[PDB]
Amino acid sequence: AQNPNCNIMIFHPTKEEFNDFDKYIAYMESQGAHRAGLAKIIPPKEWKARETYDNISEILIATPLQQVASGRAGVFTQYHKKKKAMTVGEYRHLANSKKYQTPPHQNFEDLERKYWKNRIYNSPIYGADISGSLFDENTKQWNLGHLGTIQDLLEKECGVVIEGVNTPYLYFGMWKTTFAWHTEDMDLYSINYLHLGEPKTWYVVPPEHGQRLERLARELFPGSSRGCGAFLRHKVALISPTVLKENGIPFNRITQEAGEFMVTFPYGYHAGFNHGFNCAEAINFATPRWIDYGKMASQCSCGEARVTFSMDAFVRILQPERYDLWKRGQD
Ligand SMILES: O=C(O)CNC(=O)C(=O)O
Ligand SMILES: [Mg+2]
Ligand code: NI
Ligand SMILES: [Zn+2]
């Protein structure tokens, strides 16, 4: 068995190897990458996502989200308070202000210590989930707006034609902006490209150990657990590495820098934070190996998780028993 310790693997494809996206994902899995739940891909040195970022300041962040924490430093939830619209140029200037900027630090480790000590005492503003792309249309390799769609994968593997579309999303971050512990919708893959700015630190639990994280989360968030049988779908709960280690939960960590891709694999729980002003682009995707994970994915039916149009068909075809109840939550 390849990668039996479930370590995060780092790949350096050549420009030739960067042509065929599906084939490269399958290669990484042949080497055991998926067992970690997360992999890093460093693009060949010849590749670029676009020529420059000099002209992005006029993108609108229609609903910036203030991430307000409750709890203790290592075990907390966050709620998202909606703020007034602002441009990316306005948001960048806010990120760089004395109130929001990255503090002085020695290295990524010192920054990580400061994040876990102090996150709860501040409310950073995150421009998340903005439909759009920063890849140039002429970028032919690993262009996250030109991937094969999940609907087409389901049709190729299973023969059924379904409605829905699959487009990328932009994320504008600042110091302390946080992504809570989650797997993807329908336990899909994700791919995330850090276009510019400061790093993003990731934490991940191997897919084979995901249920250990869920059991800890039920213990740590006991009212949320009674409210919903899949409350991590709400994407609000944080648990620190120190708390995971105290409770014996297997995990790994890695920091993504600008110019690098990360892939999350089906049922790979992940969480993390941004170091400073940055912009990432991410999209969900599927492979043949995903189908069985999609059939078994948990679902929020309490109504809180409220998701995309295209998830309807996935539930309807892969999980017809749950359909009915899941759609009562969505309506
Ligand atoms: O970058 C972020 O805030 C969150 N991204 C992801 O969870 C992802 O790419 O799967
Ligand atoms: Mg612009
Ligand atoms: Ni994710
Ligand atoms: Zn729920």
Task: Give long-range contacts, CB 8 A cutoff, 24+ apart: 298-302.
Answer: 298/229, 298/230, 298/233, 299/230, 299/233, 299/326, 300/228, 300/230, 300/231, 300/233, 300/234, 300/329, 301/228, 301/229, 301/325, 301/326, 301/328, 301/329, 302/227, 302/228, 302/231, 302/329
Distance 167 CA to ligand 2 centre (A): 19
DSSP 276-312: SSEEEEEEEE--TTHHHHHHH-----SSSS---TTHH
Output the CA–CA distances (angstroms, integers) from residue 178 to 20, 34, 127, 144, 253, in the order listed.
Answer: 32, 23, 11, 22, 15
Resolution value (Å, 1 decimal): 1.4
Find the angle CA(84)-CA(183)-CA(19) to the nearest 5 degrees.
95
Report which bound ligand comes closest to the CA of 61: 2
Alpha carbon of 94 to ligand 3 centroid (Å):
25
Query: Which residues are CB-contacts of 286 (< 8 A; sequence separation ≥ 6)?
Result: 150, 153, 154, 188, 189, 294
Closest ligand 1 atom number to CA of residue 270: 7
- Breaks (C–N over 2.5 Å) after residues, the chain: none
Q: Read off the amino acid at residue 123.
A: S
> At a CB cut-off of 8 Å and minimum separation 6, what does 168 contact?
131, 132, 133, 144, 145, 281, 282, 283
Question: Which phi and psi (to 5°) does residue 216 adopt?
Answer: -60, -45
Q: Ligand 1 mean position to 159 CA, how many Å?
A: 30
Q: What is the DSSP string of 208-222?
A: GGHHHHHHHHHHHSH
118: DSSP letter: H
From the CA of 192, give the closest atom in ligand 1: 9
Distance 54 CA to ligand 2 centre (A): 8
- Residue of the nearest CA to atom 2 in ligand 1? 179
CA angle 176, 110, 252 (to 5 degrees): 75
153 Cβ contact partners less than 8 Å away, ≥ 6 residues apart: 285, 286, 287, 288, 290
Residue 145: both structure tokens together: 């707006």
Given ligand 1 and candidates 179, 255, 284, which is best to mutate, with the most ligand atoms within 8 Å of its CB? 179
Q: Which ligand is nearest to the CA of 232?
A: 4
Burial class (CB in 10 A: 0-12, 13-18, 19+), 161: exposed
> How far, in Å, is the centroid of ligand 3 from the Cα of 128?
12
Six token digits for residue 137:
């249309």
173 CA: nearest ligand 1 atom: 3
Q: Helix, strand or coil for residue 71?
A: strand
**Total number of residues shown for the chain:** 331
Give distance in angstroms: CA of 126 to centre of ligand 3.
15
Contacts for 119 with CB less than 8 Å, ≥ 6 apart? 69, 73, 76, 176, 178, 238, 273
Take atom 10 of ligand 1 and give the residue whose Cα is closest: 190
Annotated binding-site positions for Fe cation: 182, 184, 270
Pick the residue whose CA is nearest to atom 9 on ligand 1.
192
CA of 228 to the centre of ligand 4 (A): 5
Q: Whose CA is nearest to atom 4 of ligand 1?
A: 179
Q: Which of these, 153, 156, 143, lies nearest to 21 by C-alpha position?
A: 143
CATH of the domain spanning 1-331 = 2.60.120.650
Pocket-forming residues, ligand 1, beta carbon under 6 Å: 171, 179, 190, 192, 264, 270, 280, 282
DSSP 101: S
- What are the extents of the domains in the chain? 1-331
Spatial separation of the C-alpha atoms in residues 19 and 43, rounded to whole Å: 11
Looking at the DSSP bridge assignments, the partners of residue 148 are: none
Binding residues for Zn(2+): 228, 234, 300, 302
Pocket test for ligand 1, best of 194, 264, 279 (most atoms within 8 A of CB): 264
**Feature table: binding site for 2-oxoglutarate:** 126, 192, 200, 235
